[PDB]
Amino acid sequence: MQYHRIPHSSLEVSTLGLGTMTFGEQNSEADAHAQLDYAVAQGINLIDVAEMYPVPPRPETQGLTETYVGNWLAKHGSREKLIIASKVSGPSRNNDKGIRPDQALDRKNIREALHDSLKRLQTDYLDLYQVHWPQRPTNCFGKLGYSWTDSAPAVSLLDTLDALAEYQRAGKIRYIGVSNETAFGVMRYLHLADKHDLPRIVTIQNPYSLLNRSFEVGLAEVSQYEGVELLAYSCLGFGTLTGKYLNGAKPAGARNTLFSRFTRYSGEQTQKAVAAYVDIARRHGLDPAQMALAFVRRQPFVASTLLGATTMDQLKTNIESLHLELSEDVLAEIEAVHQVYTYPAP
């Protein structure tokens, strides 16, 4: 395993991290524990969870992911070597059911969320606690460009940062991060930390893959100058970059076959781009999943790649991507496809 030191922190993260959002839905608790054991045996220390997992989310299963991870933590011990990252939900969205009434990123909601997460995770602190998505409407979750809003948000970034600061002082969270944010939002949080002597966010967890490189327009430069580094998610486009859905295929047991609500990587242009990337991989003798992962790993703004797997063989293949280094010729072909299909799946 390779590791990466996050600026302004004591976190040295494994270059690959283990995402967990299927734990409790597609994956059982024994599957979860087998993946956590395997990941740690391969040197991964970063485990990413959320109060809303697993997905697709519903009240009946809400919190099962954290509970499975906590049950594992209780048994395997060596807690201190792990970097357990969780999240507090933004305002309810996408017609999904909330966890709390009139859910917002204010002190009351954050206090409740954090305590419930710590209880399920069976630990007294989180290494990283992340704002899952912004309070204000912005360009995340399928929206490439920003649309002007009329309504000022109900809770400001300073409100949210001040609330988090209390729990950092209390030692319940070591570091704070954001998720599904933008260049404006990151810079505002950083401005506020300096102006008000408040904690400085250290990471942003945003989608990044061959199908959504939009982080490069505004956020990559923030990462270089400010040190807020990317924890990249959905680096296989929900599994589409493996090529498993090409030519109308709907493999049994796969995410998009089971849950047709997941459309983020199913648009017309996206499907054309997937076929093009898989073609590059096949011509260069690469596994499409590994090529997609190695492309994300090599970016200088990526601190860690959050892997997703529903089987042990998938997880083994994905961790083995560490050893793939992309050639100049493959990189140039990728650039050519990206010119034709630019940010197709925001």
The residues assigned a catalytic role are: 53
- Give the torsion through C-alpha atoms of 148, 150, 154, 156, to 10 deg: 40
**How open is the CA angle 100-103-108, to the nearest 5 degrees?**
85
Residue 203 host element (H or E): strand 203-207
Binding segment (CB under 6 A) for ligand NDP, from list 5-13, 14-22, 111-119, 120-128: 14-22
Q: Where are the beta strands (DSSP E) in 10-64?
A: 12-14, 16-19, 46-48
Sequence-distant (≥ 6) Cβ neighbours of residue 146 within 8 angstroms: 138, 139, 182
Peptide bond into 137 cis (omega under 30): no
Question: How far apart are CB 48 and ligand NDP at their closest, in Å?
Answer: 4
Among the listed ranges 99-107, 121-129, 150-158, 303-311, the one in contact with ligand NDP (CB under 6 A) is 303-311
Distances (CA, A) of 86 to 18, 190, 272: 12, 21, 34
- Please identify which residue in 69, 211, 276, 309 interacts with ligand NDP, judged by CB under 6 A: 309
Residue 35: CB minimum distance to ligand NDP, A: 10
- The residues, ordered by sequence, that sit 6+ positions from 226 with a Cβ below 8 Å of its Cβ are 186, 187, 190
- Is there binding between residue 296 and ligand NDP (CB under 6 A)? no
Is 243 annotated in some ligand binding site?
yes
Comparison of 33 and 244: residue with beta carbon closer to ligand NDP: 244
Is residue 314 a contact point for ligand NDP (CB under 6 A)? yes
For residues 99 and 332, which CB has a smaller minimum distance to ligand NDP in the complex?
99
Site map (CB under 6 A) of ligand NDP, residues 214-233, x = contact:
-------------------x
Candidates 9, 13, 19, 118; binder of ligand NDP (CB under 6 A) is 19
Q: Partners of 48 in the beta sheet?
A: 19, 85
- Per the annotation, where are the binding residues? 234-244
Q: Give binding residues for NADP(+) as ranges.
A: 234-244
Q: Can you give the binding site for ligand NDP, defined by CB under 6 A? A: 19-22, 26, 48, 179-180, 205, 233-239, 242, 244, 254-255, 289, 306, 308-310, 314, 317-318
